Amino acid sequence: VQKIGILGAMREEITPILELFGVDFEEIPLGGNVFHKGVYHNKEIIVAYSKIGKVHSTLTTTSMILAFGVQKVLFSGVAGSLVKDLKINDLLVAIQLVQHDVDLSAFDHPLGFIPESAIFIETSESLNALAKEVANEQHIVLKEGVIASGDQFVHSKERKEFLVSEFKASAVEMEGASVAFVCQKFGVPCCVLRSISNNADEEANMSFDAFLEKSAQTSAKFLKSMVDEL
Amino acid sequence: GSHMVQKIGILGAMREEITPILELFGVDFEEIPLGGNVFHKGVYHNKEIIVAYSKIGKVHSTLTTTSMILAFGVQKVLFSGVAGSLVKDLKINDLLVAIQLVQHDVDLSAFDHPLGFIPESAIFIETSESLNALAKEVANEQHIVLKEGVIASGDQFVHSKERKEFLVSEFKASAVEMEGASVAFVCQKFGVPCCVLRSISNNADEEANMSFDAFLEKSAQTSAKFLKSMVDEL
Ligand SMILES: CSC[C@H]1O[C@@H](n2cnc3c(N)ncnc32)[C@H](O)[C@@H]1O
Ligand SMILES: CSC[C@H]1O[C@@H](n2cnc3c(N)ncnc32)[C@H](O)[C@@H]1O
């Protein structure tokens, strides 16, 4: 039987996913997270929000894999735009992710890099193609790009520019790279989707609040459409 | 069940921090690969010991600790390795036990959260009072000086006056490193007692890279020797 993990960082990112799938869920508490286990179209789905940031999201991903045996992980949630052509409510699949706050430059390493790892983490080529196929099939605009993930909420042009020049990222968030990383370590196909809710600038906290619902819904509905195709 | 053979997890971040541990215990270890890590499993004084280095940084250490707990059933986690000093009385080679830890690079202040704070969590993470007390007893017994304090963890190697100043100011931390808070965090989430031990290898300032390289093996040995002394009492 197929087992799919479905992740958000915040409760508001998973509420619409629980509603849209519509089925009964069993709540299973583990490691401070609540996993919702259900059956949908023959597939077992396990849904949780990690809580914000890289440690919470690493922990939740690793639990989904080791404790619930998921064979794929789909992540949905909101992000800040780093570049002028990514506008509020746009949807983006991350083709590669980076931990933008990693700095071992004292030992001559480039920013983002840790020994025994890589700067850019890859997501699943087959699931990214599925995302593209579903967006096409539905006439949805789906952007692709690099997402930078770090443990700060980015709200300044100074940091925005650094992210774009250093890592060529298009959007910034606090969980994608860690979720993708954990899945690579365990050989689990991963897809990370984000909807834009802010421009990661002085006004980002206001915009984040005004568009959280609409942006979380946009990302949630697309994830469901992918699962309908798996 | 607490009546079963006890399983202890012992963690470092780099291979050099666990090489002396495997040697000090001196028993046969089976190597088990999982999640990009190698776990070394042995039996020592009628307890099962599971030893691994996570690789550097918060993501690597969160994943490895979650594996030790979930895949290996550890019931206590002890962490040993090296750290940078933030205070004058913590000198190269000195031992520190972390009473609390903080993720010093967490910043959601755009929403007026205090630095280090994440919604639905807390700034400071606690470790095991009983294990910390055993460390203090073991230090006394073995004659070693053992400092107690706050450890700040983040995903940057700190090597500046200005960053050390901020860590002292904001968090009153005594040392800095890249894994402790994430290990203690995962342990607290699963209800597993955790002790974080560090030996100083550098002063977290402009020459920190050179001092780190010079003292990695010696400081890792000091921390490993102390961790073994702890296990010999459990
Ligand atoms: C309340 S902290 C921000 C949350 O939304 C995502 N996010 C949205 N916009 C941004 C931004 N500008 N910088 C960092 N994270 C963001 C993050 O992944 C985190 O879960
Ligand atoms: C090589 S990156 C530094 C490694 O040693 C620890 N460490 C020692 N000194 C420091 C320092 N000054 N800043 C950050 N981490 C340090 C960290 O936990 C990490 O595994």
Nearest to A37 by CA among A61, A66, A4, A9: A4
Phi and psi, residue A205, nearest 5°: -70, -40
The CA B83 to ligand 2 mean position distance, Å, reads: 5
Q: Which domain holds residue B184?
A: 1-234
Could you give the residue ranges of the DSSP H alpha helices within B172-231?
180-189, 208-231
Kindly report the CATH number assigned to the domain that includes residue A113: 3.40.50.1580
Which among B36, B57, B120 is the nearest to A102, CB-wise? B57
Q: List the determination method.
A: X-ray
A138 Cβ contact partners less than 8 Å away, ≥ 6 residues apart: A225
C-alpha separations of B27 from A26, B50, B234 in Å: 44, 12, 17
Report the alpha-carbon angle B223-B211-B57, nearest 5. 60
Count of other CB atoms within 10 angstroms of residue A228: 10
Report the alpha-carbon angle A30-A33-A38, nearest 5. 80
Start-to-end Cα distance in chain A: 12
Q: Which two tokens stand for residue B33?
A: 């690969």
Count of other CB atoms within 10 angstroms of residue A214: 13
A vs B: CB pairs below 8 A: 119
Buried b (16+ CB within 10 A) or exposed e, A101-135: bbbbebeeeebbbbeebebbbbbbeebbebbeebb
Write the secondary structure of chain A as one string of H (helix), E (strand) and C (coil): CCEEEEEECCHHHHHHHHHHHCCCCEEEEECCEEEEEEEECCEEEEEEECCCCHHHHHHHHHHHHHHHCCCEEEEEEEEEECCCCCCCCCEEEEEEEEECCCECHHHCCCCCCCCCCCCCEECCHHHHHHHHHHHHHHCCCEEEEEEEECCECCCCHHHHHHHHHHHCCCEEECCHHHHHHHHHHHCCCEEEEEEEEECCCCCHHHHHHHHHHHHHHHHHHHHHHHHCCC
For residue B116, give the 3-state DSSP assignment: coil
CA distance B153 to A28: 30
CA distance B233 to B221: 19
Phi-psi region of B83 (alpha: psi -120 to 50; beta: other; left: phi over 0): beta
CA distance A9 to A215: 13
Q: Is the CB of B53 under 6 A from ligand 2?
A: no
Q: Which residue of A has its CA nearest to B189?
A: A31
Residue A12 exposure: Cα atoms within 13 Å on the Cβ side: 12
Report the alpha-carbon angle A93-A197-A83, nearest 5. 65
Start-to-end Cα distance in chain B: 17
Contacts of A56 in chain B (CB under 8 A): 118, 121
For testing contact with chain B, the best of A28, A62, A178 (most B CBs within 10 A): A62
Nearest to B111 by CA among A174, A179, A113, A103: A174
CA distance A188 to B54: 19
- Number of structural domains found in chain B: 1
CA distance B54 to A21: 37
The alpha carbon of residue B53 and the mean position of all alpha carbons in its chain are separated, in whole angstroms, by 11
Name residue, tokens 């997270």. A33
Q: Which two tokens stand for residue A148?
A: 């930078």
Nearest to A106 by CA among B82, B201, B213, B92: B213
Buried b (16+ CB within 10 A) or exposed e, B22-39: bebbeeebeeeebbbbeb
Q: Which two tokens stand for residue A17?
A: 């996913």
Residue A202 exposure: Cα atoms within 13 Å on the Cβ side: 0
CA distance B234 to B225: 15
Calculated CA dihedral for residues A133, A188, A179, A44, nearest 10 degrees? 80
At residue A36, what is the residue type?
Answer: H
Contacts of A113 in chain B (CB under 8 A): none
- Environment class of residue A206 by beta-carbon count within 10 Å: exposed (0-12), middle (13-18) or buried (19+)? exposed
Element at B196 (helix H, strand E): strand B194-202
CA distance A219 to A226: 11
Q: Are the beta carbons of B29 and B42 closer than 8 angstroms? A: yes
CA distance B68 to A212: 36
- How far does the CA of residue B217 sit from the closest CA of chain A (Å)? 17
Q: Whose CA is nearest to atom 10 of ligand 1?
A: A80
Q: Which two tokens stand for residue A179?
A: 């979720």
Phi and psi, residue B219, nearest 5°: -65, -40
A103 Cβ contact partners less than 8 Å away, ≥ 6 residues apart: A111, B155, B156, B157
